Amino acid sequence: EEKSKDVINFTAEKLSVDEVSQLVISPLCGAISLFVGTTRNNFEGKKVISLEYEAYLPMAENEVRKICSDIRQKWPVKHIAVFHRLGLVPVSEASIIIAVSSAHRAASLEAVSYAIDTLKAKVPIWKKEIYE
Amino acid sequence: EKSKDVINFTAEKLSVDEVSQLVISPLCGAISLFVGTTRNNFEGKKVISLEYEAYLPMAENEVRKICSDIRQKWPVKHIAVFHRLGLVPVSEASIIIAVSSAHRAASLEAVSYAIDTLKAKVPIWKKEIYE
Amino acid sequence: SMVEVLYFAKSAEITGVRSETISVPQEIKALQLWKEIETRHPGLADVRNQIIFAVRQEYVELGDQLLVLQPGDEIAVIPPISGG
Amino acid sequence: SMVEVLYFAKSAEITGVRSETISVPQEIKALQLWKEIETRHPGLADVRNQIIFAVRQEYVELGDQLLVLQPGDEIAVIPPISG
């Protein structure tokens, strides 16, 4: 009996794909999908050096818990990890990492997809492009 | 700047971090990954490992086709496909696919297409090893 | 009650402050509450059409919704969001 | 042409070898290529419905498609894929 986990973290730390992927591994699970959001070096024609992120905590936390819970109402997932970085995210470093594990692959891919979409639509977080 | 198709078959332990690293581009805001891992049970029996055999270098070439077709359907940048051969113990990774793009929809859809098409067209077989 | 208004993203740039406390009746409709806030930093008039509230961390659209606010409740001014 | 036949998965359990060499005419029918293989290993008869070929690392159906096989070419016997 392995408890299902929803691991949610907002943090100024640099995010690790390996760290986060390990938080969702399960001997009962054959599939892990991950989404990693990274700062692009440009936006609408101007060059970008960094994004800056802020959030309404703890509401953003609660809203992600709701996403976790809705995901488990449809899809047979085991573990969900959602890691969002706050403040300054320079180019090519990760602002978000979402991971989901399940027994089969459709669940993990679809739940990751619903998670990132729903996060962008519902979770009180905001970015400011910092230009050259 | 140069779009990459990184394909590799190996008997070594696969690393999510190493593979994510290979698809990073300043031009991309998105990376999707699929990771398959050995489950500990099959049809109700307990499983200690999974054994993978491939036909190379045909497999590698069927994966090239899948890349190319991916780049025709979706504005992607980098694609990594790594499959482990041999014994893959419980909770270790048999496959890692990673795709980067400007925006998320392309990477998510490419990854999904890759794993489906890989499971259908690529000459690889697995035997379950039980307790 | 005395409530805490939180200003996020653009809305903090305009008001010029991350938060403040203001006093509001116990019962007030959400539009009426926005009007109080708008009154208090008229720059916010510009974005009156692209803002939502969170009241006690739950979304509230600016209309006839009747709010029953308790002391210390949080009213967040939520410009259009951009996570991930 | 002396060609290499490779038995993957089920096909190798049945044949008892991972590969063998066979001599076949340069121009040969895919199903003819099959009959030559069954003949060495009649057992493969039982798996016949479930096999496909790969010639020079490109797939091909067991039909009357006409093959041209050069010496040393590989012919893979591919039962259903589980990667």
Curated annotation (Swiss-Prot), chain B:
Q: Which UniProt keywords apply?
A: Cytoplasm, Disease variant, Molybdenum cofactor biosynthesis, Phosphoprotein, Transferase
- Any one cellular-component term (Gene Ontology): nucleoplasm
Gene Ontology MF term list: molybdopterin synthase activity
Top-level taxon: Eukaryota
| Subcellular location(s) per record | Cytoplasm, Cytosol
Query: Pathway, per UniProt?
Result: Cofactor biosynthesis; molybdopterin biosynthesis
Kindly state a single biological-process term from the GO annotations of this entry.
molybdopterin cofactor biosynthetic process
EC number(s) per entry = 2.8.1.12
Q: Give the main localization category.
A: cytoplasm
- EC primary class: transferase
**Catalytic activity annotation:** 2 [molybdopterin-synthase sulfur-carrier protein]-C-terminal-Gly-aminoethanethioate + cyclic pyranopterin phosphate + H2O = molybdopterin + 2 [molybdopterin-synthase sulfur-carrier protein]-C-terminal Gly-Gly + 2 H(+)
- The record lists substrate as bound by 103-104, 119, 126-128
Q: Cite the record's tissue specificity text.
A: Highest levels are found in heart and skeletal muscle. Lower levels are present in brain, kidney and pancreas. Very low levels are found in lung and peripheral blood leukocytes.
Q: Which disease is it linked to?
A: Molybdenum cofactor deficiency B: An autosomal recessive metabolic disorder characterized by neonatal onset of intractable seizures, opisthotonus, and facial dysmorphism associated with hypouricemia and elevated urinary sulfite levels. Affected individuals show severe neurologic damage and often die in early childhood.
Q: What else is known?
A: This protein is produced by a bicistronic gene which also produces the small subunit (MOCS2A) from an overlapping reading frame. Expression of these 2 proteins are related since a mutation that removes the start codon of the small subunit (MOCS2A) also impairs expression of the large subunit (MOCS2B).
Cite the record's note on assembly.
Heterotetramer; composed of 2 small (MOCS2A) and 2 large (MOCS2B) subunits.
In the record, the note on similarity to other proteins reads: Belongs to the MoaE family. MOCS2B subfamily.
Q: What is this protein called?
A: Molybdopterin synthase catalytic subunit
Native species of this protein?
Homo sapiens (Human)
Starting at the broadest rank, the lineage of the source organism is: Eukaryota, Metazoa, Chordata, Craniata, Vertebrata
What would be the name of the gene that encodes this protein? MOCS2
Span of the entire protein shown here: 41 to 171 of 188
Curated annotation (Swiss-Prot), chain C:
What does this protein do, in the record's words?
Acts as a sulfur carrier required for molybdopterin biosynthesis. Component of the molybdopterin synthase complex that catalyzes the conversion of precursor Z into molybdopterin by mediating the incorporation of 2 sulfur atoms into precursor Z to generate a dithiolene group. In the complex, serves as sulfur donor by being thiocarboxylated (-COSH) at its C-terminus by MOCS3. After interaction with MOCS2B, the sulfur is then transferred to precursor Z to form molybdopterin.
Q: What Gene Ontology molecular-function terms does this entry list?
A: molybdopterin synthase activity; nucleotide binding
Know the name of this protein? Molybdopterin synthase sulfur carrier subunit
- Indicate yes or no for the key word Cytoplasm: yes
Q: Which residues carry this modification: Glycyl adenylate?
A: 84
Q: Which domain of life is it from?
A: Eukaryota
One matching Pfam family is: ThiS
Q: In which pathway does it act?
A: Cofactor biosynthesis; molybdopterin biosynthesis
- Associated disorder: Molybdenum cofactor deficiency B: An autosomal recessive metabolic disorder characterized by neonatal onset of intractable seizures, opisthotonus, and facial dysmorphism associated with hypouricemia and elevated urinary sulfite levels. Affected individuals show severe neurologic damage and often die in early childhood.
What are the record keywords, sorted?
Answer: Cytoplasm, Disease variant, Molybdenum cofactor biosynthesis, Nucleotide-binding, Phosphoprotein
- Organism, per UniProt? Homo sapiens
Could you describe the post-translational modifications of this protein? C-terminal thiocarboxylation occurs in 2 steps, it is first acyl-adenylated (-COAMP) via the hesA/moeB/thiF part of MOCS3, then thiocarboxylated (-COSH) via the rhodanese domain of MOCS3.
Q: Give all cystine bridges in this chain.
A: none
UniProtKB/Swiss-Prot annotation, chain D:
The Gene Ontology biological process annotation of the record reads: Mo-molybdopterin cofactor biosynthetic process
Q: In which tissues is it expressed?
A: Widely expressed. Highest levels are found in heart and skeletal muscle. Lower levels are present in brain, kidney and pancreas. Very low levels are found in lung and peripheral blood leukocytes.
Q: Which pathway or pathways does this protein act in? A: Cofactor biosynthesis; molybdopterin biosynthesis
Main subcellular localisation:
cytoplasm
Q: Which Pfam families match?
A: ThiS (PF02597)
Q: Give its localization.
A: Cytoplasm, Cytosol
Q: Which InterPro entries match?
A: Beta-grasp_dom_sf, MOCS2A, MOCS2A_euk, Mopterin_synth/thiamin_S_b, ThiS/MoaD-like
Q: Give the record's disease field.
A: Molybdenum cofactor deficiency B: An autosomal recessive metabolic disorder characterized by neonatal onset of intractable seizures, opisthotonus, and facial dysmorphism associated with hypouricemia and elevated urinary sulfite levels. Affected individuals show severe neurologic damage and often die in early childhood.
UniProt cross-references to PANTHER family, sorted A to Z:
MOLYBDOPTERIN SYNTHASE SULFUR CARRIER SUBUNIT
Family to which the UniProt record says this protein belongs: Belongs to the MoaD family. MOCS2A subfamily.
- Tell me, what does this protein do in biology? Acts as a sulfur carrier required for molybdopterin biosynthesis. Component of the molybdopterin synthase complex that catalyzes the conversion of precursor Z into molybdopterin by mediating the incorporation of 2 sulfur atoms into precursor Z to generate a dithiolene group. In the complex, serves as sulfur donor by being thiocarboxylated (-COSH) at its C-terminus by MOCS3. After interaction with MOCS2B, the sulfur is then transferred to precursor Z to form molybdopterin.
Subunit-level organization: Heterotetramer; composed of 2 small (MOCS2A) and 2 large (MOCS2B) subunits.
HAMAP family documented for this protein? MOCS2A
Q: What is this protein called?
A: Molybdopterin synthase sulfur carrier subunit
Q: What is the organism of origin for this protein?
A: Homo sapiens
